[PDB]
């Protein structure tokens, strides 16, 4: 049988049963909530820094940690030594995966900007697996609505990410963007930054003079480099010690709503009063992960 969906090269024909995957760049956490580890050969080595890959992958001697690089990642032939059905893909190098695709192996090519198109792109990769992802979708944009419903008459606070210095930020066509807004952050990196994320000088991070400052899952920095950063000493952000590591989740996937619950929580949160977060959180990973109620205890907040 086969199935066809479309992706960043356009129309794909993916064979199936779909036994073999690898996952490169990014949907790190997509086996995890399909629980569809056994049908994993690869995966960036970046994922099993996941605290819902650590948890959920139960076998991971097996698993080939591959290159996280954008992209010329561990090339062509570790790829046919692995032998996968399909490889899954971010896109940082169009070129480089243009190439891959001429070896006969499929490949499955995204490049999410947004949670939505992070939803869309999960929704064709579970025609490809053959599993049903409409409830654990549900679950996804029930979240969504409820952060929105929250910050409803709730002015954004100005605050920006940093990634793998303290002068590199996101701005349009970036899904860390679109987490930042969706948790109620006017992210100033919009300004300067027309694609993706940047370096932008110091001068002109001191001058927008961020309320808040959240730091990248992945990056080098603590929020102990920043605070201490001398050349920061003048911004808002650091006065009032708002700034912020974001929690061990990937976001190219299936836990992007909370990574803004996150955000909203550390800069909103008084839009939160009475709410019971961890219920929100608990029922979270029982729907989307299928985890039972010890398993779900490490992954509350606090």
């Known amino acids: 049988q ?10 794909q024909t993916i064979k ?41 992958l139960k076998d991971p001697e ?21 032998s996968p059905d399909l490889v899954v893909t971010f896109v940082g190098n169009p070129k480089a995966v243009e190439h891959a695709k001429k070896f006969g192996i499929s490949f499955l090519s995204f490049q999410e900007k947004t949670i939505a198109e992070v939803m869309e792109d999960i929704d064709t990769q579970a ?9 654990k979708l549900a679950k996804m944009q029930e979240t969504l609505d409820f952060i929105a419903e929250r910050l409803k008459g709730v002015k954004k606070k100005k605050g920006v990410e940093l990634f793998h210095k ?26 300067y930054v027309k694609f993706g994320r940047a370096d932008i000088s110091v001068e002109k991070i001191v001058k927008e003079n961020p309320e808040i400052i959240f730091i990248w899952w992945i990056s080098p920095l603590s929020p102990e480099d920043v605070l201490n950063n001398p050349k920061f000493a003048t911004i808002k952000a650091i006065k009032n010690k708002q700034v912020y590591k974001l929690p061990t989740m990937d976001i190219g996937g299936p836990r992007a709503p909370l990574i803004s619950l996150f955000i909203a929580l550390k800069a909103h949160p008084e ?13 979270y990973y029982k729907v989307v992960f299928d985890l039972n109620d010890a398993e779900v205890e490490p992954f509350l907040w606090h």
């Open 166 to 191: 303290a002068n590199k930020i996101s701005g349009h066509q970036a899904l860390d963007s679109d987490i930042l807004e969706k948790g109620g952050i006017d992210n100033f990196g919009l300004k």
């Open 271 to 283: 839009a939160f009063k009475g709410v019971d977060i961890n219920a929100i959180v608990k029922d």
């Open 2 to 11: 086969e199935v066809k969906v479309k992706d960043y090269f356009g129309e």
């Open 127 to 135: 025609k490809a697996l053959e599993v049903d992802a409409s409830k």
């Open 62 to 82: 097996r698993i080939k940690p591959m290159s996280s690089d954008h992209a010329a990642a561990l090339n062509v032939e570790l790829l046919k030594k692995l």
């Open 16 to 56: 199936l049963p779909v036994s073999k995957i690898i996952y490169l760049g990014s949907f790190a956490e997509v086996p995890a909530m399909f629980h569809t580890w056994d049908r994993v050969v690869g995966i960036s080595d970046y994922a099993f820094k996941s605290d819902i890959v650590k948890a959920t």
